[PDB]
Enzyme design. Structure first.
Site, PDB file in Angstrom:
ATOM      1  N   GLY E  29       0.793  -1.230   0.000  1.00 40.56           N
ATOM      2  CA  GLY E  29       0.000   0.000   0.000  1.00 40.56           C
ATOM      3  C   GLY E  29       0.823   1.276   0.000  1.00 40.56           C
ATOM      4  N   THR E  30       0.135   2.417  -0.040  1.00 40.21           N
ATOM      5  CA  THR E  30       0.795   3.727  -0.054  1.00 40.21           C
ATOM      6  C   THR E  30       1.321   4.070   1.334  1.00 40.21           C
ATOM      7  OG1 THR E  30      -1.193   5.059   0.442  1.00 40.21           O
ATOM      8  CG2 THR E  30      -0.757   4.552  -1.882  1.00 40.21           C
ATOM      9  N   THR E  31       2.207   5.060   1.399  1.00 33.47           N
ATOM     10  CA  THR E  31       2.827   5.452   2.662  1.00 33.47           C
ATOM     11  C   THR E  31       1.883   6.314   3.498  1.00 33.47           C
ATOM     12  OG1 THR E  31       4.952   5.551   1.471  1.00 33.47           O
ATOM     13  CG2 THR E  31       4.915   6.368   3.747  1.00 33.47           C
TER      14      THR E  31
END
Ligand SMILES: *[B]([O])([O])[C]([C][C]([C])[C])[N]C(=O)[C]([C]C1=[C][C]=[C][C]=[C]1)[N]C(=O)C1=[C]N=[C][C]=N1
Ligand SMILES: *[B]([O])([O])[C]([C][C]([C])[C])[N]C(=O)[C]([C]C1=[C][C]=[C][C]=[C]1)[N]C(=O)C1=[C]N=[C][C]=N1
Ligand SMILES: [Cl-]
Ligand SMILES: [Cl-]
Ligand SMILES: [Mg+2]
Ligand SMILES: [Mg+2]
Ligand SMILES: [Mg+2]
Ligand SMILES: [Mg+2]
Lengths: 244, 204, 231, 241, 243, 222, 196, 250
Positions: E29-31
């Site tokens: 996933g994204t940060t």
């Protein structure tokens, strides 16, 4: 999920057989032989306890012959624990019938009920069937003396003489050979013990390896008496018939 | 309206010397209308005797229930139930219907087969045990029965004397009650013989 | 492979194959396009027929006077989800005397689809939805995936060959967003967008399905000779 | 080989999921130790904060179950907190129903029965934790009772749990072989804590700062955990003799 | 083998491979990050702009629980929403019975127990999210991070997603260089920088910055989104630092 | 009914009368109103007889099982709590009014429970129709620091007050003493009226007095 | 019943009579109507003794479980648990409860919960059948930030009159003092308070 | 959630074997030796207190348990399974008997109830059988003294004397030579201690052996006086000292 571990106890094989019923019958074929013989004046129930010990308390022991009511009894072949579950249910059914109609339950009706319970475990629920075969010995005022057998499939049939458990093929041939319709209880007692004595896997047939019972109208006047034989009484009948 | 006094009837029990007696009338009615003169109120399960007064449908139902239970008890225990144990079974069974009770007045009578001790016990409609030494009464003429028993009764009566005492207690109590009578039965109970006698009484 | 037997099983790389297979059902489905301006939102859907004797499967469903969607994938699943939206739109009206926000409608669809991806026995929904609507914050367009992911967009397309229409809209972004107070031109842009996803077949009178909602325009569906104007 | 996935018997009569839950117990790589004084029960446990971004005050495997009962856990924290929350609920319910504070041994049995159920019922997995309950019981006095994933439990004079439990166990065994009593003959709990820390140092062969340890103390009518400064005072006393 | 095919099964190691596979979804996933400041907390997240068609500032990722707790997560977004819905039920029933708003440590365990429950049975899947959350209560500021296993701890700074290593390194510098503490307005600026620095792991597509914060002085202990000038000020500060 | 409880310095004593009634009629002249919950916890009960017997045995059963589970001597507060929560559940429809007493590892205790589930604590208590006669005696003669012998007398004097002055109380006095360290001693009929009238005449009948119609032997055997 | 709770400078004091009645018969003359739901959160009970005991027991259980998870609860939180039970079960309960507690942050607080299940935070509160007779006296004599000794006198005098006029009230005057110092129990006998 | 294992985990194999019951019996075989001997005026049950650690207080772990005042139980196999069975056995003795008949159940019927519970774990959905074999010794008025064995299948058999667990084969042979129908209780205790010594490796004393009897009524253990018919429990656990006294006359 849970599906992964499901044995699926209630399915048909490609041949149209119920796996678990067939395997339960295989289990029962290793159980101590039990024999029922119907006569004109009574019924005999004989059964072999499985490789016992000298330290077993026989007089208080019961693994084969059970009482359902005053008129009906059963001989067990298979898992004893499974049988006691069904026996207690049968005892209750008889009492329900008695309470409802104020009459003792006809033998077939009780047998059908238990056999229907067994059937249910083969068609629904996903549980293993009862690894038990019964011989029902009973009396009522419609059909008189009756012998039935039921097995894990829930199928039941009526008999003049029948065996369940181990060596039934050998036992049934021997019964079919010496059984006659005009036979009496005392003769049937002898036939039962002689058959067991030949089909047993033990070296010799003794009192401590047997359970024995009779249902007789040999009760004072028009009524029926159940007799579960005591160890000493089994020892006496063994001598009387000339086996020991 | 009052369920305990629609059908009518009475039961009485007494202890004697190595014996007990239990008796009942035979009337069953619909208030003023007498319907049956053969309605016995005493039953027995083995050697234990149970008398039941009150609403007749429940008398019948409880008999069928205690027959049911004592029959299973015997199959499992491999022996007949004793009076002391049956008394606890009656109490248990009644109290389970605490807030919807059977409208009855049971009376247990018998002799313990092992100790030989005579035993009687009475209950209210919901299970309370009255374990009297002398006598137990129940029914629509219970007041009358109390008076008769309290005056007539003496301890350690012989079977054939006890019969006269309990019979006269019942008969004269029933004759002062409109809903009791129409016949009577007396059970004389000893450790291994029981005699049942039907009494001749006024049929009004 | 060994981890695609049910929706309750992650793969070793952290993938949910049953959800991905449900996503695949959308790609097999017929193309549909969604796009909006500041005043209006438009759905355009290429309907698919079984053969020449058959009718053309309906692609657009009305949810409320101010909201509706187009479908791509399993049509029965769209019926279930659209029925759910109808109820939620309706609950908002009856209880709060309030038209359901398009963004909140998307949140409700996301959460409903999600429950089917984490539980044993069930299955993911096998359909993708493009929801358009006009609420108190103007025109809106949503893209629903049965993974649960809902996304608010200016324009988009889902179904087979949808990449062509999506690239076109990505070029035309600055043009069609400005088409305010002109429904016919916004539909034209949508019809031109869906044309980029066509091969062999072309837009006929019983092939094309168009819907529109806007400022003073209830959600209305156009089929048959009503869309001949735009062919 | 599905007899290794759920809690059913293998041909050897073994429950492999229970055995693997025991192995999860040492996943944290923390050693705990419990000893009994005259008036108190002391439990110490290694505290390891490997990340600098962690709030060290929230890193704990010791729990205050009730006013009287304390519990240290050897195993992963999610299962630890699962057990803690249940034990708290059970202790509170017990007091409400029966009108007195749940004893340490009774709670241990209750949690052990719950654990037993997971070893018999297939849909429930065992918790990968060993629960050490401590208190000063109003009837039995200083008490240490420990529960494991098999559903087994027993009372202890002293005990140790973790990867290096055996080294600590033998160290404690040897001390009680000398003293020939079932407890630390000491008046103040402060000195019992000092004993506990001293014998862990000897057994493990490692020195401790104030942030390397975590201490719980049970006295009559209350269980409490020591702060870093309370432990520092304890470490100073050990070093000065 | 076969121990990784079913949830709640212990491998011979004593591991739950299904939970470890859920972590892979989180790492994909994204940060997203969290920064604990002097009197509150700051949350920030990387939003990948997959296409130009995405409406800016509309697809909001950070979620509020009650009025004082902020939640952000990386991994499967629907799973994170499901967890927040539960959190909102948990917070509501707490306030209903006890009157006071749910404390952050109390709230943390509610999520923790719920996520942990999804590692107990094979009839459910573990959560495919690591959730960073926190806020201000009566005892001050709290920041937490919650993993698929149900494991959670208190944090000075927290980070998860694809650029977590980069972010963590940056958070560690702030902790070392500011032992006395960081202000709320400073934390917002630093949060913007860290997301921009952590974007090197997702450098293919461009992104949109989203920040929120709870602070006793700046927001009266309520959760609020960083908007307009304050957001642009943080973006400018972030863009200056990468160049 | 007159039931009492009195604490003394090293334990507690309980007492009760022995009359049961249906309206103005006496049903039982020697009812045992003292019950065992556990070996050293007894309760006296007034109100609906079946309810006092049933609720006392139910909680007695659960106390036994609890004692086995916990490997401890049962406490009086445990019986008290289990009882009241059960009585409360049934909003007073279970007509049990009790005096609960006993000794346990915490000491000696004396309590009362009303049918609706309210509990009280005291050194001396009384319940029942004769409760007012008894309490008048207790309020007149009670002092603190009683001996076992003084407390028994005070308790049985209180029970006598009800016997004589209350119509719902009669006959004999039952007592039970729970002392710390000792076994509980249940004193069935600690007091009975001595002697008593012989009736003037025996009403034993001449045999054959009662007219009979039929006779038969009853088959009780199998 | 005559019960009251009064906040003062150092904290709060609860006060109550000790009479329990079944009609005109005093079933208990030494009742303790001041009950503890937490270390420094107590309550005053009026109405049904069975209902108020059952409620208090449940509250004590809730706060014990609260403490195990979240630490010491506020007095407001305790009042909310009382309220929740009294409000949701208002058809089947007859309970008039005063909740009083001491925090270090909030100091002495008093909440009253009458029949309906409503909550009212007050400087002081009076309740029970005997409270009716001292509304005038208590309103005229109450001051905020009283000393411990002044508050004890205020409660003693107030309940003295409530007892004097109300037949449902009597016996001893029990009091419980809640401060930072701890918990102190006080008792005052008839010979003392009747001559006031 | 929900228990989704509503199907049997114990099933018949092609040979007719119930695997899980067989494997449960294997677990019992590995268990520590326990035995039971019936005398004319009593019954004795005994086992080794196999302490898992010398720091563990083995007195807190009771292998021999009172079920009713006249019935006791001992086991071989998995301790935790035994512990929960004892809890259920104690409760069922009240719910299915004492609360109905106002008296404690006779040994055989309590055994029947325990057996039923164990049978159900062999057939019900989502459970394994109990991994224990029980030896239940008891007394009642009409049946006298009795000793029963209960297996994982739910089957139960009455014994004059028997052993289960580790060295049961050797122990049963030892008991066959020594047992007769004229044994007094003290003679049975003596034989029990002799039989149990063979299977024990290490320390053999009152602290490492657990032994209880069903014998005479103990009015000293009743706790109260005043009811003639109540005479006290027949179950009694022998103390560490009482065992050691008999080990000197061994
Ligand atoms: B005592 O008066 O409180 C006494 C207590 C003891 C016997 C349990 N109570 C009774 O005697 C009650 C009185 C009563 C009458 C009617 C309804 C309710 C209560 N008697 C009975 O419960 C009772 C006893 N035996 C038969 C019928 N009723
Ligand atoms: B007080 O009078 O309100 C008092 C408070 C209670 C907590 C002890 N209540 C009672 O005394 C009530 C009756 C009542 C009187 C006045 C107002 C409201 C209620 N008594 C009981 O609840 C009671 C009485 N006898 C036995 C058991 N319970
Ligand atoms: Cl339990
Ligand atoms: Cl009160
Ligand atoms: Mg008449
Ligand atoms: Mg007439
Ligand atoms: Mg399991
Ligand atoms: Mg007054």
């Amino acid at each position: 999920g849970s599906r992964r571990y499901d044995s699926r106890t209630t399915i048909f094989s490609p041949e149209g057989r119920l796996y678990q019923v067939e395997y339960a019958l295989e289990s029962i074929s290793h159980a101590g032989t039990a024999i029922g013989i119907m006569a004109s004046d009574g019924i005999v129930l004989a059964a072999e306890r499985k490789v016992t010990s000298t330290l077993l308390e026989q007089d208080t022991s019961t693994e084969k012959l059970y009482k359902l009511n005053d008129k009906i009894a059963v001989a067990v072949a298979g898992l004893t624990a499974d049988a006691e579950i069904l026996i207690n249910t049968a005892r209750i059914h008889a009492q329900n019938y008695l309470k409802t109609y104020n009459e003792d339950i006809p033998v077939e009706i009780l047998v059908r009920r238990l056999s229907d319970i067994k059937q249910g475990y083969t068609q629904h629920g996903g549980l293993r069937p009862f690894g038990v075969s019964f011989i029902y010995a009973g009396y009522d005022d419609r059909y008189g003396y009756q012998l039935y057998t039921s097995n894990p499939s829930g199928n039941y049939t009526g008999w003049k003489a029948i065996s369940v458990g181990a060596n039934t093929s050998a036992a049934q041939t021997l019964l079919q050979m010496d059984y006659k319709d005009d036979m009496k209880v005392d003769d049937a007692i002898e036939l039962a013990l002689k058959t067991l004595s030949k089909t047993t896997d033990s070296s010799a047939l003794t009192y401590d390896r047997l359970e024995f019972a009779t249902i007789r109208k040999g009760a004072n006047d028009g009524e029926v008496y159940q007799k579960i034989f005591k160890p000493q009484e089994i020892k006496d009948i063994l001598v009387k018939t000339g086996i020991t | 309206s009052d369920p305990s006094s629609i059908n009518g009837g009475i039961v009485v029990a007494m202890t004697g010397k190595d014996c007990v007696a239990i008796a009942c009338d035979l009337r069953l009615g619909s208030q003023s209308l007498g319907v049956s003169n053969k309605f016995e109120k005493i039953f027995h399960y083995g050697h234990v005797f149970l008398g039941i007064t009150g609403l007749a449908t429940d008398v019948t139902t409880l008999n069928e229930m205690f027959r049911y239970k004592t029959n299973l008890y015997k199959l499992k225990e491999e022996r007949a139930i004793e009076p002391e144990t049956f008394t606890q079974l009656v109490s248990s069974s009644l109290y389970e219907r605490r807030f919807g009770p059977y409208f009855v007045g049971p009376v247990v009578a018998g002799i313990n087969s092992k100790s030989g001790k005579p035993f009687i016990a009475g209950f209210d409609l919901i299970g309370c045990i009255d374990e009297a030494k002398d006598f137990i009464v129940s029914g629509t003429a219970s007041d009358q029965l109390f008076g008769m028993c309290e005056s007539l009764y003496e301890p350690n009566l012989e079977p054939e004397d006890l019969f006269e005492t309990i019979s006269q207690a019942l008969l004269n109590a029933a004759d002062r009650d409109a809903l009791s009578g129409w016949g009577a039965v007396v059970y004389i109970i000893k450790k291994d013989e029981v005699v049942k006698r039907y009494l001749k009484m006024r049929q009004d | 492979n060994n981890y695609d037997g049910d929706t309750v099983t992650f793969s070793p790389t952290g993938r949910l194959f049953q959800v991905e297979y449900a996503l695949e059902a959308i790609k097999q489905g017929s193309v549909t396009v969604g796009l909006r301006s500041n005043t209006h939102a438009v759905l355009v859907a290429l309907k698919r027929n079984a053969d020449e004797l058959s009718s053309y499967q309906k692609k657009i469903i009305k949810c409320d006077e101010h909201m509706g969607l187009s479908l791509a994938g399993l049509a029965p699943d769209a019926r279930v989800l659209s029925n759910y939206l109808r109820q939620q739109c309706n609950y908002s009206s009856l209880v709060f005397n309030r038209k359901l926000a398009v963004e909140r409608a998307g949140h409700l669809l996301c959460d409903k689809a999600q429950k089917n991806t984490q539980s044993y026995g069930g299955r993911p929904y096998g359909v993708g939805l493009l929801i358009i609507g006009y609420d108190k914050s103007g025109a809106h367009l949503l893209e629903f995936q049965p993974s649960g992911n809902v996304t608010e967009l200016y324009g988009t397309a889902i179904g087979a060959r949808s990449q062509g229409a999506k690239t076109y809209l990505e070029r035309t972004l600055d043009t069609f967003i400005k088409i305010d107070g002109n429904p016919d031109e916004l539909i034209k842009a949508g019809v031109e967008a869906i044309s980029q996803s066509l091969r062999d077949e072309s837009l006929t009178v019983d092939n094309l399905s168009i819907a529109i909602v806007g400022k003073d325009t209830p959600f209305t569906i156009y089929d048959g000779e009503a869309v001949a104007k735009y062919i | 080989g599905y007899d290794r996935h759920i809690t059913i018997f293998s041909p050897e009569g073994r429950l492999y999921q229970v055995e693997y839950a025991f192995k999860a117990t040492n996943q944290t790589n923390i050693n705990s130790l419990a000893v009994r004084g005259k008036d108190c029960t002391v439990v110490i446990s290694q505290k390891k904060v490997p990340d600098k971004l962690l709030d060290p005050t929230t890193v704990s495997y010791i729990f205050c179950i009730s006013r009287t009962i304390g519990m240290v856990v050897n195993g992963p924290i999610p299962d630890a907190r699962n057990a803690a929350l249940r034990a708290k609920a059970e202790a509170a319910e017990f007091r409400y129903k029966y009108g007195y504070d749940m004893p340490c041994d009774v709670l241990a049995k209750r949690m052990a029965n719950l654990s037993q159920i997971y070893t018999q019922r297939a849909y429930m997995r065992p918790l990968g934790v060993i629960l050490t309950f401590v208190s000063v019981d109003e009837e039995l006095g200083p008490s240490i009772y420990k529960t494991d994933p098999a559903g087994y439990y027993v009372g202890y004079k002293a005990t140790a749990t973790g990867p290096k439990q055996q080294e600590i166990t033998t160290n404690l065994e040897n001390h009680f072989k000398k003293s020939k009593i079932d407890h630390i003959n000491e008046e103040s709990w402060e000195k019992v804590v000092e004993f506990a820390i001293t014998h862990m140092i000897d057994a493990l062969g490692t020195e401790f700062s104030k942030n390397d340890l975590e201490v719980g103390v049970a006295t009559k009518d209350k269980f409490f955990t020591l702060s870093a400064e309370n432990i520092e005072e304890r470490l100073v006393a050990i070093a000065e003799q | 083998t076969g121990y990784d095919l079913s949830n709640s099964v212990f491998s011979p190691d004593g591991r739950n491979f299904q939970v470890e596979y859920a972590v892979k979804a989180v790492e994909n996933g994204t940060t997203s990050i969290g920064i604990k400041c002097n009197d509150g907390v700051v949350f920030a997240v990387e939003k990948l702009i997959t296409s130009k068609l995405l409406v800016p500032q509309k697809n909001v990722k950070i979620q509020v629980v009650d009025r004082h707790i902020g939640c952000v997560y990386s991994g499967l977004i629907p799973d994170g929403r499901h967890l927040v819905n539960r959190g909102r039920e948990e917070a509501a029933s707490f306030k209903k019975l006890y009157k006071t708003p749910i404390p952050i440590p109390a709230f943390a365990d509610r999520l923790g127990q719920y996520v942990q429950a999804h590692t107990l049975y094979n009839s459910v899947r573990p959560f495919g999210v690591s959730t960073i959350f926190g806020g201000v209560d009566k005892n001050g500021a709290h920041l937490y991070m919650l993993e698929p296993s149900g494991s959670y701890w208190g944090y000075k700074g927290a980070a998860t997603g694809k650029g977590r290593q980069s972010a963590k390194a940056e958070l560690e510098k702030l902790v070392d260089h500011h032992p006395e503490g960081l202000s709320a307005r400073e934390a917002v600026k630093q949060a913007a920088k860290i997301i921009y620095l952590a974007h090197e792991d997702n450098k293919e597509k461009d992104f949109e910055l989203e920040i929120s914060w709870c602070s006793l002085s700046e927001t009266n202990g309520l959760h609020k989104f960083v908007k307009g000038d304050l957001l642009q000020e943080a973006i400018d500060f972030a863009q200056k630092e990468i160049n | 009914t007159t039931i009492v409880g009195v604490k003394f310095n090293n334990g507690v004593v309980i007492a009760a009368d022995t009359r049961s009634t249906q309206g103005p009629i006496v049903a039982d002249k020697n009812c045992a109103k003292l019950h065992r919950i556990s070996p050293k916890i007894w309760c006296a009960g007034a109100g609906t007889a079946a309810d006092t017997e049933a609720v006392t045995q139910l909680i007695g059963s659960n106390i036994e099982l609890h004692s086995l589970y916990t490997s401890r001597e049962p406490r009086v507060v445990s019986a008290l709590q289990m009882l009241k929560q059960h009585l409360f559940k049934y909003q007073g429809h279970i007509g049990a009014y009790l005096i609960v007493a006993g000794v346990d590892p915490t000491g000696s205790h004396l309590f009362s429970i009303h049918a609706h589930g309210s509990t009280d604590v005291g050194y001396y208590l009384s319940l029942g129709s004769g409760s007012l006669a008894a309490m008048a005696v207790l309020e007149s003669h009670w002092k603190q620091d009683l001996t076992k012998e003084e407390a028994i007398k005070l308790a049985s004097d209180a029970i006598q007050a009800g016997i004589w002055n209350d119509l719902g109380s009669a006959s004999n006095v039952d007592v039970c003493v729970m002392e710390i360290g000792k076994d509980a001693e249940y004193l069935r009929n600690y007091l009975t009226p001595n002697v008593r009238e012989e009736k003037q005449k025996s009403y034993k009948f001449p045999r054959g007095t009662t007219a009979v119609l039929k006779e038969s032997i009853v088959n009780i055997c199998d | 019943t005559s019960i009251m709770a009064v906040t003062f400078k150092d904290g709060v004091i609860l006060g109550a009579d000790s009479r329990t009645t079944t009609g005109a018969y005093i079933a208990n003359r030494v009742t303790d109507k001041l009950t503890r739901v937490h270390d420094k959160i107590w309550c005053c009970r009026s109405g049904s003794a069975a209902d108020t005991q059952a409620i208090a027991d449940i509250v004590q259980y809730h706060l014990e479980l609260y403490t195990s998870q979240y630490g010491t609860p506020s007095t407001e939180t305790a009042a909310s648990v009382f309220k929740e039970l009294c409000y949701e079960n208002k058809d089947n309960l007859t309970a008039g409860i005063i909740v009083a507690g001491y925090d270090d942050k909030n100091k002495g607080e008093v909440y009253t919960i009458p029949l309906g299940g409503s909550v009212h935070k007050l400087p002081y509160a009076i309740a029970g059948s005997g409270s009716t007779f001292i509304y005038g006296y208590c309103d005229k004599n109450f001051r905020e930030n009283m000393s411990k000794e002044e508050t004890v006198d205020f409660i003693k005098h107030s309940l003295s009159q409530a007892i004097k006029w109300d037949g449902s009230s009597g016996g001893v005057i029990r009091m419980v003092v809640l401060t930072a110092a701890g918990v102190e129990r006080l008792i005052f006998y008839p010979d003392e308070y009747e001559q006031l | 959630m929900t228990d989704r294992y509503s199907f049997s985990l114990t099933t018949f194999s092609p040979s007719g074997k119930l695997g899980q019951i067989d494997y449960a019996l294997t677990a019992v075989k590995q268990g520590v030796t326990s035995l039971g001997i019936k005398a004319t005026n009593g019954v004795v049950i005994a086992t080794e207190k196999k302490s898992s650690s010398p720091l563990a207080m083995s007195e807190t772990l009771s292998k021999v348990s009172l079920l009713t005042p006249d019935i006791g139980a001992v086991y071989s196999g998995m301790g935790p399974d035994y512990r929960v069975l004892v809890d259920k056995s104690r409760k069922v003795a009240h719910t299915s008997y004492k609360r109905i008949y106002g008296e404690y159940p006779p040994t055989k019927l309590l055994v029947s109830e325990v057996a039923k519970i164990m049978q159900e774990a062999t057939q019900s959905g989502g459970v394994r059988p109990f991994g224990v074999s029980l030896l239940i010794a008891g007394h009642d008025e009409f049946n006298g003294f009795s000793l029963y064995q209960v297996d994982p299948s739910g089957s139960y058999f009455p014994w004059k004397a028997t052993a289960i667990g580790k060295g049961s084969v050797a122990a049963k042979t030892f008991l066959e030579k020594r047992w007769n129908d004229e044994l007094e209780l003290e003679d049975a205790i003596h034989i029990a201690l002799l039989t149990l010594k063979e299977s024990v490796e290490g320390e053999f004393n009152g602290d490492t052996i657990e032994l209880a009897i069903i014998g005479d009524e103990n009015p000293d253990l009743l706790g109260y006086t005043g009811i003639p018919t109540d005479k006290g429990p027949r179950f009694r656990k022998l103390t560490s000292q009482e065992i050691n006294d008999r080990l000197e006359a061994l």
